[PDB]
Subunit: 369 residues, 2 copies
């Protein structure tokens, strides 16, 4: 019937698990759903430790904070990502260093990472953009050579793989989102993943207001209220049971687009690195508009008439007022993808026929056969 | 049957409202439950504007941030409160200034506020401790005289009144919590209250990642992911319908304690200022232990044997390692209340007979008649 860009997929299992929380009275800080969801999620990723938090933004904040990021530190990030990749650098008092993206993968270009390293660089936040893993063997090699931490922004990439390893398990710390449009949702929520048990323990302590559990209201350091609630965790357990089903659907939609755009010179889907498997959170394309002479917003209005919802690519962060002081270089590939890019519908509510209809209608609107 | 210190009170209305959210697919950022809960809450408080956020900590952070609190600013706070009153000052880069509390009300002592004002003071965060309103006519008079903002930490005080005005509507901005133990819960959540519509509009924008709604992913300033979710708001609407019932129960429990401790020289309940009505979140007492020669933890173990749960008073924040640099003065009254104080059970799950049993058993354990 209807095409959905990124709507969540909720039904009877979610209702059941949420009613179990209300009935147990475990909806808040204390309860068994949070540690159950932490352990089931860490098992899915094949990582030692996970900590459940209130958002993906909080996950990235807590990861940088745990790693001791502070004023004077430089943190390298792509120019194309959601702004919540970068804001946490500024929360810590650190300096973002923006680098351009690969023209085919749309991910942080490691050659641009290496050119931007200084005596002040402490970390890299690669983003698995639209669920597409970054060039992690090269990123990790650069980080090892310069003594840098790697924080994976895996928020769009739950289920994506890099050479048989789940995203979020390669860097020093991984960060996930369970916001409404992500491949699973808790309404709001996120997760920290790490193989360092000490980092994971200290982060769980910090996101629970740094309260000494052996005392009453005694706090040995400054913390945060960043914990996931048990209400959210009960929903996240239901969604995690369905995650394999959802990723099958995402990968199917992506393959349906990869086919109908096949051999069409004017449409380039985002490309995977060899050995990587995208989660295909939002199959996204670059359009060669030279022959077409329509803008993306014109293409989007034509699609909207046909009941096909879309979204533009993240704006280049270097043109936001707080970040333009850090605009260093042309960011040619970032601008090409923003100017010519479009994200296509991929809610797990969709049928294969809906996706095929979307891809075929776009070819009509663009006057291709 | 069982006495409960502060457990939430959830049943069929909460289940109904939460299932309406899951069924509508509105569990995340977008949806009608958040603005419905904002408007119903603002009507309950008789204030122009409310913004729903992810915690009480976030509410206080966003309030200080909105008011332009920054490095070099001094913010006056009580030495006895939950640490999340103070942490947000440090999140903003500002300096906390700790002052002692009134020996009878346990609230921020306005004479100590005035002695601690300097050329750098920008704001005061009075705390309505255990739901007991502060001396707001005097606090507001001091703030007017020195050009200071007043941010009410009303997190424990939903339903409390000051001279016929609801707490959170007196200062420039009010802050509420819906954590599991508060008088209502959304699992996790909070609320900003203000009569300044511009402050409320800019705060709602900031807690939604400062995204320009007229564009796609364009952010004109640094924001936060601090919004309440629609799942949380659907639960908060159910609880808000029951708030009058719950406050009746809280005030009943408090009056039951006020009676059985009546004329007993060794037990002093927290006192209200003339014209104020506590929400009695946790009826809390100071014990004259000179004749009794038991510590509070000894008294708590005796109560625990009788199935009476209790909690100690918030620790004095000036003895936490990050804050001891700001310990300026003796804080005599803060230490007296911590050393001799105890919080008594007041979950809205309790019966009047449970409370009477608790109060009477304490008199036995203390060897009073």
């Amino acid at each position: 019937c209807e095409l959905y860009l990124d709507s969540p997929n909720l039904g009877e299992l979610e209702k059941e698990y949420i009613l179990k929380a209300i009935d147990s009275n475990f909806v808040s800080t204390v309860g068994p759903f949070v540690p159950e969801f932490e352990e089931k999620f860490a098992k899915y990723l094949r990582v030692t430790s996970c900590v459940a938090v209130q958002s993906g933004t909080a996950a990235i904040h807590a990861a940088l904070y745990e790693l001791g990021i502070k004023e004077g530190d430089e943190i390298i990030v792509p120019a194309i990502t959601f702004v919540a990749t970068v804001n946490p650098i500024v929360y810590c008092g650190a300096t973002p260093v923006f680098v351009d993206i690969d023209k085919d993968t749309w991910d942080i270009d490691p050659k641009e990472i290496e050119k931007s390293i200084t005596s002040k660089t402490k970390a890299i936040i690669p983003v698995h953009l639209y669920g597409n893993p970054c060039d992690m063997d090269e990123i990790m090699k650069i980080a090892e050579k310069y003594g840098l931490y790697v924080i994976e922004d895996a928020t769009e990439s739950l289920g994506a793989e890099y050479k048989g390893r789940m995203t979020g398990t390669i860097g020093h710390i991984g960060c996930f989102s369970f916001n409404g449009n992500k491949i699973i949702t808790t309404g709001g929520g996120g997760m920290i993943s790490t193989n360092n048990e000490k980092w994971a323990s200290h982060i769980k302590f910090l996101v629970n207001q740094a309260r000494d559990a052996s005392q009453g209201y005694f706090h040995p350091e400054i913390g945060f209220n960043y914990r996931m609630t048990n209400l959210e965790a009960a929903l996240g357990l239901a969604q995690l049971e369905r995650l394999p089903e959802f990723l099958k659907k995402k990968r199917m939609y992506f393959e349906a687009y990869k086919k109908i755009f096949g051999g069409i010179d004017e449409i380039a889907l985002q490309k995977e690195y060899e050995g990587a498997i995208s989660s295909a959170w939002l199959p996204s394309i670059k359009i060669d508009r030279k022959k077409i002479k329509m803008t993306i917003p014109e293409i989007q209005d034509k699609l909207k008439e046909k009941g096909i919802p879309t979204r533009r690519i993240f704006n280049p962060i270097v043109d936001f007022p707080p970040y333009v002081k850090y605009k260093n270089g042309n960011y040619h590939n970032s601008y090409e993808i923003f100017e010519n890019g479009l994200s296509l519908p991929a809610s797990t509510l969709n049928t294969l026929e809906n996706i095929e209809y979307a891809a075929k209608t776009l070819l009509n609107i663009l006057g291709i056969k």
